[PDB]
Short mmCIF file of C-alpha atoms in Angstrom, two decimals:
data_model
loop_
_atom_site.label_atom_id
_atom_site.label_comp_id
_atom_site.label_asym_id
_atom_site.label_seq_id
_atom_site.Cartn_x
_atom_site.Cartn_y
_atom_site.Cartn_z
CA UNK A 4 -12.57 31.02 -27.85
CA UNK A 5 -13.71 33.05 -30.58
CA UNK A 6 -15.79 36.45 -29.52
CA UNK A 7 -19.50 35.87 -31.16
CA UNK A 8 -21.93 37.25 -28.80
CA UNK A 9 -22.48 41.36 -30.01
CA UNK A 10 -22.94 43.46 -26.30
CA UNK A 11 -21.46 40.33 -24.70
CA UNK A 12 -17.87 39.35 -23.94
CA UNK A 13 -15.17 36.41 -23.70
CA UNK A 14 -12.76 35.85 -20.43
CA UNK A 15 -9.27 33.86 -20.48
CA UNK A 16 -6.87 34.08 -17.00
CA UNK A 17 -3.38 33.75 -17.39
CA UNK A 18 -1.91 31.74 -14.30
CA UNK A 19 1.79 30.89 -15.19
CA UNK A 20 4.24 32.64 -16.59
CA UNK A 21 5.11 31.91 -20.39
CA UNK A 22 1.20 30.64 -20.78
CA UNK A 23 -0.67 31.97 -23.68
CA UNK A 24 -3.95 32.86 -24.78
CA UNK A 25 -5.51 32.77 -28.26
CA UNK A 26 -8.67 34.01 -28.81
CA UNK A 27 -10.24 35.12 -32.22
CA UNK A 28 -12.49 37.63 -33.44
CA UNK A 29 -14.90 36.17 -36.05
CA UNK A 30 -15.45 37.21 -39.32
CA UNK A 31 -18.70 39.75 -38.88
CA UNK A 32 -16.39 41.38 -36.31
CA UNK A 33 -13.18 41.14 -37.67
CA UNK A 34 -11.25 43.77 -36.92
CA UNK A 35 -9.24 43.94 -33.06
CA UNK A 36 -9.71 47.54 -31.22
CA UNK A 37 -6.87 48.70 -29.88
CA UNK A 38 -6.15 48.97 -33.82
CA UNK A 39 -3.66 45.73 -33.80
CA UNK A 40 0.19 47.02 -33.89
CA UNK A 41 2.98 44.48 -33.43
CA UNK A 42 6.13 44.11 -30.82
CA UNK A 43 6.74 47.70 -28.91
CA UNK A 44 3.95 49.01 -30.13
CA UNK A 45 0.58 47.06 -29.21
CA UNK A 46 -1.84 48.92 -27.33
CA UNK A 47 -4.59 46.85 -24.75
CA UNK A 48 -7.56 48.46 -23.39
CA UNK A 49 -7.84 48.76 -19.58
CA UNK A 50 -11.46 49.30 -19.35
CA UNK A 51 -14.40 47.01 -21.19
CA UNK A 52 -15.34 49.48 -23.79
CA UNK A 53 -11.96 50.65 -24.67
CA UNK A 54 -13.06 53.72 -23.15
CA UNK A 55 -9.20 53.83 -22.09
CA UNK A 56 -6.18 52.26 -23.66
CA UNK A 57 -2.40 51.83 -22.90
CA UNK A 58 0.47 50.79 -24.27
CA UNK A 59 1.18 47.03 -23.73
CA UNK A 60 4.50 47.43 -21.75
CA UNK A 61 2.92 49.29 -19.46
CA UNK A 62 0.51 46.95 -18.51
CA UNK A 63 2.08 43.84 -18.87
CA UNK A 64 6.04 44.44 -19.11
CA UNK A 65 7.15 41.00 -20.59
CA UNK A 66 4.49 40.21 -22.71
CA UNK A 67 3.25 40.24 -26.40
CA UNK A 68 0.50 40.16 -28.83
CA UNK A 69 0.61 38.01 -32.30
CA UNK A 70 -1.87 38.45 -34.96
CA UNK A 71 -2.51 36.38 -37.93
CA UNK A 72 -5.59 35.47 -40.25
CA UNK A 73 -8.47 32.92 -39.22
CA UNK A 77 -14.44 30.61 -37.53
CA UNK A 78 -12.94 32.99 -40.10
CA UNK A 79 -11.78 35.95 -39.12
CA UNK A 80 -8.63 37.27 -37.39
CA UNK A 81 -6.63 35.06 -34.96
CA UNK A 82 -4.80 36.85 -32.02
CA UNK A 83 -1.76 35.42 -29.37
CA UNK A 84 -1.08 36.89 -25.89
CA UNK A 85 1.89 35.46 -24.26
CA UNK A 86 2.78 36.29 -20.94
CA UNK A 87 6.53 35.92 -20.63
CA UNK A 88 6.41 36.88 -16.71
CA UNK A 89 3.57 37.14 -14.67
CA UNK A 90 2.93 41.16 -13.25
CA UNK A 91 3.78 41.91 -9.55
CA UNK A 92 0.07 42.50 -9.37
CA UNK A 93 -3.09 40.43 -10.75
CA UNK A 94 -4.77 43.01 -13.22
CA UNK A 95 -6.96 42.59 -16.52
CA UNK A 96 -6.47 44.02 -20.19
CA UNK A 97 -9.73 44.22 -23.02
CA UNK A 98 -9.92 44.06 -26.34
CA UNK A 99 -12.71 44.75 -28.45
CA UNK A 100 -13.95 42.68 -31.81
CA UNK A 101 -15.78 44.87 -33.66
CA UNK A 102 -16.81 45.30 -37.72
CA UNK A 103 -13.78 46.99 -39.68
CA UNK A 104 -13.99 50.49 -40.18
CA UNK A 105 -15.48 50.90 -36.93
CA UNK A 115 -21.25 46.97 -20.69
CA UNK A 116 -19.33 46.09 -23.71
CA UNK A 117 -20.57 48.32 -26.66
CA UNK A 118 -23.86 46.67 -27.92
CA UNK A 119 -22.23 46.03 -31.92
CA UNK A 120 -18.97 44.79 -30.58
CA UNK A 121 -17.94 41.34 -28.11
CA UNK A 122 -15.70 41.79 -25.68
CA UNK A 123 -12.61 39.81 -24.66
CA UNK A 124 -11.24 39.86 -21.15
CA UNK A 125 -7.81 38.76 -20.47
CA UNK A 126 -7.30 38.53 -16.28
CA UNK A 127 -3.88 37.80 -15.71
CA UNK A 128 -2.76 36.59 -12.09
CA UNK A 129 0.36 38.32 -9.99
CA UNK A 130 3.66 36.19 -10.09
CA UNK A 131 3.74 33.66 -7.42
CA UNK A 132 6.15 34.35 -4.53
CA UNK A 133 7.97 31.28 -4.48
CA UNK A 134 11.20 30.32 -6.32
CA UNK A 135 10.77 28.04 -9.47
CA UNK A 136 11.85 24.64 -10.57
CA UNK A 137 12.12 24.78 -14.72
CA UNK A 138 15.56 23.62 -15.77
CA UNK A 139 16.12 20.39 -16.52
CA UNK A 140 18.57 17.85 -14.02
CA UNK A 141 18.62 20.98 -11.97
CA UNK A 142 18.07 20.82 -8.08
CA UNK A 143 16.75 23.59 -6.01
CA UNK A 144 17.17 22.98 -2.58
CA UNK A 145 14.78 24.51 0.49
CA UNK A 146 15.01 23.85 4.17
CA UNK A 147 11.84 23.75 6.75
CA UNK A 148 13.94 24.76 10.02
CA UNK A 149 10.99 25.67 12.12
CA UNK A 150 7.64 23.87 13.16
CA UNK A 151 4.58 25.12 12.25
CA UNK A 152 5.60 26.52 9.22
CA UNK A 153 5.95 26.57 5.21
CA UNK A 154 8.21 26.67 2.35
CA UNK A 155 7.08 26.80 -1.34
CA UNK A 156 7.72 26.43 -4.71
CA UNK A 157 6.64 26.49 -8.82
CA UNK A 158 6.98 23.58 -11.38
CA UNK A 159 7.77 26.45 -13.94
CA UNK A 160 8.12 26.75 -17.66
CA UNK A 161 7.79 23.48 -19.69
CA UNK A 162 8.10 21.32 -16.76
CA UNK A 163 4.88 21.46 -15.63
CA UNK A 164 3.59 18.21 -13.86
CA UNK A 165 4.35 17.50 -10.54
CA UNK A 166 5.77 13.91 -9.06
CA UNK A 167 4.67 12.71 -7.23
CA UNK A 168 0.87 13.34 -8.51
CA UNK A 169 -0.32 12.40 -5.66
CA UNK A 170 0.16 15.13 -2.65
CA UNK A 171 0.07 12.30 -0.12
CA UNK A 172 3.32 10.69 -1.66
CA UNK A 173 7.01 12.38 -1.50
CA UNK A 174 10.37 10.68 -3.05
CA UNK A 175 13.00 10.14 -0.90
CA UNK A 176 16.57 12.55 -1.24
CA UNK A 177 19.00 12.60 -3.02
CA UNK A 178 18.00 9.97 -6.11
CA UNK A 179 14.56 11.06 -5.88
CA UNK A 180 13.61 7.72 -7.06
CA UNK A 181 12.06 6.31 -4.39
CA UNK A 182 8.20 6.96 -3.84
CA UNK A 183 7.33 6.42 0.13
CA UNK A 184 3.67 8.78 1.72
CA UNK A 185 4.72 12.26 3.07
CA UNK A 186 3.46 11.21 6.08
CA UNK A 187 6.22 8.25 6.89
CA UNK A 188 8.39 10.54 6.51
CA UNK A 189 7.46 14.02 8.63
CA UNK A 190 4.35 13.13 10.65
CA UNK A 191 1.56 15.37 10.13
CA UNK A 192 3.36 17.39 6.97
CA UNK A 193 0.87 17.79 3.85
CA UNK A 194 1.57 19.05 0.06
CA UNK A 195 -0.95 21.69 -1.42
CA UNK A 196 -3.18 20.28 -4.43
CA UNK A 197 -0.87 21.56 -7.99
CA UNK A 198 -2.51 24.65 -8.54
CA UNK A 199 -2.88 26.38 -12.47
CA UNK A 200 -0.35 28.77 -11.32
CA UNK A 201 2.38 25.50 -10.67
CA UNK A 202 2.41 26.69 -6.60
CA UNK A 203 3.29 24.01 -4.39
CA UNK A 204 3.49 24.65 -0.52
CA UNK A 205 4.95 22.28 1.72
CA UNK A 206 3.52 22.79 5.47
CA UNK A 207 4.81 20.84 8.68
CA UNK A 208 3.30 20.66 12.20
CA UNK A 209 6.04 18.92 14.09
CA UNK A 210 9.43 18.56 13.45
CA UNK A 211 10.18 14.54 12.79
CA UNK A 212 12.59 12.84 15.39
CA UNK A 213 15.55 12.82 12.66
CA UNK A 214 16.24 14.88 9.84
CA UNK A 215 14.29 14.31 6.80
CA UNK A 216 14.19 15.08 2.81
CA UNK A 217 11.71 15.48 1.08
CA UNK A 218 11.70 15.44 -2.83
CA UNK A 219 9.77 16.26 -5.61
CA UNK A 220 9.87 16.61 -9.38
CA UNK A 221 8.53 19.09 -12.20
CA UNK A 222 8.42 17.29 -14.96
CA UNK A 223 7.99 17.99 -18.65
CA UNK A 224 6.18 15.26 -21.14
CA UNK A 225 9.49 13.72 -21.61
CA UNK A 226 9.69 13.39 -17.85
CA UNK A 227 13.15 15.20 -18.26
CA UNK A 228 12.98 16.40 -15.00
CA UNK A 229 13.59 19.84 -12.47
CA UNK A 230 13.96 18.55 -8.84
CA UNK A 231 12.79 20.16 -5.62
CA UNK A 232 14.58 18.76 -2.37
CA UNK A 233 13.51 19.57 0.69
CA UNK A 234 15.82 19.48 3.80
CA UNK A 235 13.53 19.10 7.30
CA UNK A 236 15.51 19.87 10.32
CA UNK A 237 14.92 17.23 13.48
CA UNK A 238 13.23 18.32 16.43
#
């Protein structure tokens, strides 16, 4: 986390929106290049070597930059309030005050991923409700914000509508369906072969550490 290799460099990726990435720049190289401004004004570099540089904003339209005193050192916070339309990387540089990554400086890497195209489940006692109409097909969504994990953990299990309580396998339910592994991003896609013989719900829940939860239901037409 903190930059200490001169003519090397340090990578974070930023997955979800409102994530955040602290990174530090040691003591020897204290000093952040773009020259640290707060708010409206932080500038990023968009090349390794700061060879270019842009206004934050620009870059990364909801985000910001925090700075605040460190091992030792200086002690910097990029939050990512919502994830770009496109995945694309900002640099920094640590370097010594005054002052291929340049060979006295480290480099730190920030990649940050596009927005997922799928709505998102991060209110609490809230239900968003999708439909799979069609066989052979998808429908998606993101355990966003602060509710994070997904219930059922396991992608073979589903809870039945509307309680979404009850804990039965996907599989009992829509023969064939499967649940994508969580990914860092909070994507979930829900994919069905067959229709089942009746209509079906599925249901699942983004859940914070209080296990307050957001809850996904699922309507799956009959065949």
């Amino acid at each position: 986390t903190s930059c200490e290799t001169e003519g090397s460099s340090i990578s974070f990726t930023v997955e979800k929106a409102g994530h955040v990435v602290r990174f530090n720049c040691p003591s020897t190289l204290e000093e952040i290049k773009p020259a640290y401004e707060a708010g409206d004004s932080t500038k990023v570099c968009t090349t390794a070597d700061c060879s270019n540089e842009a206004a934050l904003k620009d870059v990364l339209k909801s985000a910001s930059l925090a700075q605040a005193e460190g091992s030792g050192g200086n002690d910097f916070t990029l939050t990512v309030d919502a994830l770009p339309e496109a995945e694309t990387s900002v640099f920094f540089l640590c370097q010594r005050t005054g002052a291929a990554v340049p060979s006295d400086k480290c480099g730190v890497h920030i990649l940050v991923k596009a927005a997922p195209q799928a709505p998102v489940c991060s209110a609490q006692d809230h239900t968003l409700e999708l439909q799979i109409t069609a066989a052979n097909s998808d429908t998606s969504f993101v355990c966003g914000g602060t509710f994070n994990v997904i219930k059922p953990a396991n992608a073979a299990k589903v809870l039945q509508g509307d309680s979404c309580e009850t804990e039965v396998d996907l599989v009992s339910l829509v023969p064939h369906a499967s649940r994508s592994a969580l990914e860092q991003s909070g994507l979930i896609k829900l994919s069905v072969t067959d229709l089942p013989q009746q209509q079906q719900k599925l249901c699942y829940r983004c859940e914070d550490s209080s296990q307050k939860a957001c809850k996904v239901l699922v309507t799956v037409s009959a065949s």
